[PDB]
Each structure stands twice: as C-alpha cells, then as structure tokens.
Amino acid sequence: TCPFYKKIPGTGFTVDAFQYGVVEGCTAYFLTHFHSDHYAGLSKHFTFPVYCSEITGNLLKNKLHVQEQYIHPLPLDTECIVNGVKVVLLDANHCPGAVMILFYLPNGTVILHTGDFRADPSMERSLLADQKVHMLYLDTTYCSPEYTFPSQQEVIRFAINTAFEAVTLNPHALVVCGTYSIGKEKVFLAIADVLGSKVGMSQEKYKTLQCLNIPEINSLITTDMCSSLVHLLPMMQINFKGLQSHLKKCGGKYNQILAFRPTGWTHSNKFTRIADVIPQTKGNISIYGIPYSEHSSYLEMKRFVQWLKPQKIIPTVNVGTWKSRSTMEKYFREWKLEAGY
Numbered sequence: 448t449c450p451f452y453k454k455i456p457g458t459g460f461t462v463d464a465f466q467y468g469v470v471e472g473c474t475a476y477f478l479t480h481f482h483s484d485h486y487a488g489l490s491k492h493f494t495f496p497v498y499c500s501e502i503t504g505n506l507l508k509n510k511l512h513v514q515e516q517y518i519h520p521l522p523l524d525t526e527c528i529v530n531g532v533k534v535v536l537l538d539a540n541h542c543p544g545a546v547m548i549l550f551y552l553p554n555g556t557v558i559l560h561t562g563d564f565r566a567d568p569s570m571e572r573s574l575l576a577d578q579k580v581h582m583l584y585l586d587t588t589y590c591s592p593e594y595t596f597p598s599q600q601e602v603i604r605f606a607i608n609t610a611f612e613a614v615t616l617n618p619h620a621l622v623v624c625g626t627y628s629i630g631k632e633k634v635f636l637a638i639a640d641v642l643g644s645k646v647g648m649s650q651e652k653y654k655t656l657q658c659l660n661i662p663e664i665n666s667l668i669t670t671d672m673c674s675s676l677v678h679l680l681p682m683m684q685i686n687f688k689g690l691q692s693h694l695k696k697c698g699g700k701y702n703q704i705l706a707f708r709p710t711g712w713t714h715s716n717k718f719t720r721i722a723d724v725i726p727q728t729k730g731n732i733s734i735y736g737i738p739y740s741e742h743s744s745y746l747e748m749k750r751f752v753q754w755l756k757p758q759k760i761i762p763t764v765n766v767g768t769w770k771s772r773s774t775m776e777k778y779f780r781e782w783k784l785e786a787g788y
C-alpha cells in the first residue's frame with residue numbers, strides 16, 4: 448500500500464509510486480527520475496499513463512521496454528494541463544532527466560515535489576520565483592548539519608588534476624571509474640577529455656548513455672575498450688581484487704590502475720578537505736573515494752527552504768525512524784524561526 452507522502456491530495460496523482468500495484472484513485476503516475484528506488488515496479492506490462500521528462504521517457508522505452516502509447520514526456524519550464532490540472536516540470540540538478548514537479552491544485556493550493564534534487568541558487572530564478580508554494584515534498588537525504596561536501600566543480604577539478612598527473616608520469620597507467628546507475632557522468636567525461644581519450648564501457652552502459660541527450664556524445668564514448676584509456680566498470684568491481692582481474696584482461700597494455708569511486712558523503716568529510724584526499728593503495732593499484740554529490744548539502748537545503756518559505760514541509764527521505772523524523776522537524780522549526788515565516 449502506497450504511503451501518504453507519495454500522494455498529491457486533490458488530484459488523481461501519485462509520484463514515484465510504481466511498486467504498490469494499482470493505486471486506488473490514481474489516473475496518472477508521475478516519475479521524477481530513472482533511479483531504481485523510484486521506478487521500482489515499472490516494466491513492459493505497465494498500462495497506465497506515466498508522466499516524466501523526455502530523457503526519463505527514452506530510458507523507460509529502451510531500458511525497461513515500457514510501450515510508447517503509455518509514455519507521456521513533457522517539456523521543461525512549460526505550463527502543461529494533465530487530467531485537468533496545471534503542472535510544470537523543473538530541472539532538479541540531480542541525474543540526467545531528473546525533475547521537480549509544480550502542481551497548481553484546482554482549489555488554489557500550490558505544491559512543489561522536489562523528487563531527488565541538489566538545491567542551487569539558480570532555482571531562485573526559475574518559474575518558482577513567480578508564486579507562493581503552500582506545501583513542499585522535500586528530498587531530505589542529507590538533512591543534518593554534519594553533511595558537508597564540496598561543490599561539484601571543486602571535485603571535478605581534483606579528479607582531472609589527479610588523473611592528468613598520473614598518466615603523464617606513467618603513459619602505461621589505465622584510469623577506471625565506477626558506476627551503478629545514471630548520474631555523475633561528468634566524473635568520467637571530464638577525465639577522458641583531459642586525457643584525449645573516449646570513455647570505454649559495456650554495451651549495456653553504452654545503451655543507457657545513448658538515451659541521455661548529451662551533446663556530441665558519439666564523440667565521447669565507445670564500446671571498443673582497446674581504443675580507450677578511461678574504462679567504466681560496475682561499482683562492485685572497484686576494489687583491489689576486481690581491479691587486478693580487469694588489468695589481466697588488458698593484455699599487458701597497462702601496468703598501473705588509478706580508480707575513482709564517486710560516493711555521496713562519507714565520514715572522512717567531517718575531517719578532510721578535498722585538496723588533502725589520498726587514495727587506498729596496494730601495489731600498482733590506487734583507489735580514490737571522491738565526494739561527488741547529486742543531493743543537497745545541509746546548507747544548500749536550508750538556503751532553498753528559507754527562500755521558498757513553504758507553509759508545510761513533508762519529507763520524502765529518512766521517514767522510517769522516529770529519531771530521523773524528530774531531527775528533521777526540529778531543523779524545519781529552526782529555519783522558520785530564524786527567517787521569520
């Protein structure tokens with residue numbers, strides 16, 4: 448049974464609610480982004496209308512084989528009418544194709560559902576600037592002040608400088624980057640660009656990237672592993688054992704691996720600056736954990752909410768424990784008292 452925080456009151460709509468069977472009263476199922484915890488339940492046998500971005504709709508058709516007649520892609524930043532209700536999709540600054548959804552209820556209530564997002568001051572000049580929001584369904588993934596991490600630009604500067612140094616010192620070093628979902632493509636694309644290489648990967652990953660409308664992508668990626676010195680591997684293979692095994696397969700072309708694991712936050716963030724990050728090393732293999740987040744830091748979240756000034760907040764992440772819920776509610780009240788709404 449579908450939880451209340453996935454239902455939009457006063458509509459026939461649900462958000463990211465595909466694992467509950469037929470939801471009573473639902474006339475349109477919205478999907479914010481193509482990550483498995485959110486699409487869980489969709490397949491080629493789904494026969495209700497799904498509303499989403501163009502990029503999410505490419506992934507649904509080619510990866511999950513959802514039939515075309517049930518995919519309803521909407522343009523961003525554009526007022527659309529769905530089953531009698533005005534909606535707008537906004538870029539969520541999450542993974543490719545990820546959106547926030549603005550619903551303009553027939554009774555005058557305005558609701559923002561962030562989906563998964565990384566709050567940014569650029570959102571303060573979207574279509575959100577133009578009207579009041581009563582209810583905010585908020586991605587609270589890192590809603591506590593211990594969650595700090597650098598900008599995505601600082602992290603990519605670290606990665607490019609580390610990779611270029613290593614490979615210039617040793618032209619026989621291979622770079623490997625871990626992946627297990629869409630998102631974070633700038634890590635491997637920025638490293639391959641500085642090295643003058645295409646990124647090499649499996650046919651299944653190539654297929655996924657071909658759905659993302661990234662400009663000039665045919666120039667940047669390939670399935671010919673032998674032609675590339677930046678390889679993508681599943682995140683589970685980014686360990687000394689899996690990397691040793693991969694280096695064997697490359698036929699003595701390479702004699703060293705430098706590997707990256709883009710994580711979100713890890714507790715080494717509460718002590719160490721990005722500049723001071725060091726790898727774990729075993730022989731000719733080094734592994735860097737880099738804090739490349741596609742979710743809001745605590746401070747980014749707080750700034751967004753204090754600007755938007757919603758009347759009510761409904762968290763969508765960390766809702767399963769009383770301790771988490773009580774923590775989050777305490778911060779929402781602080782933010783409101785400090786800002787004066």
Ligand code: NI
Nearest residue numbers: 480482541563
């Ligand atoms: Ni996500």
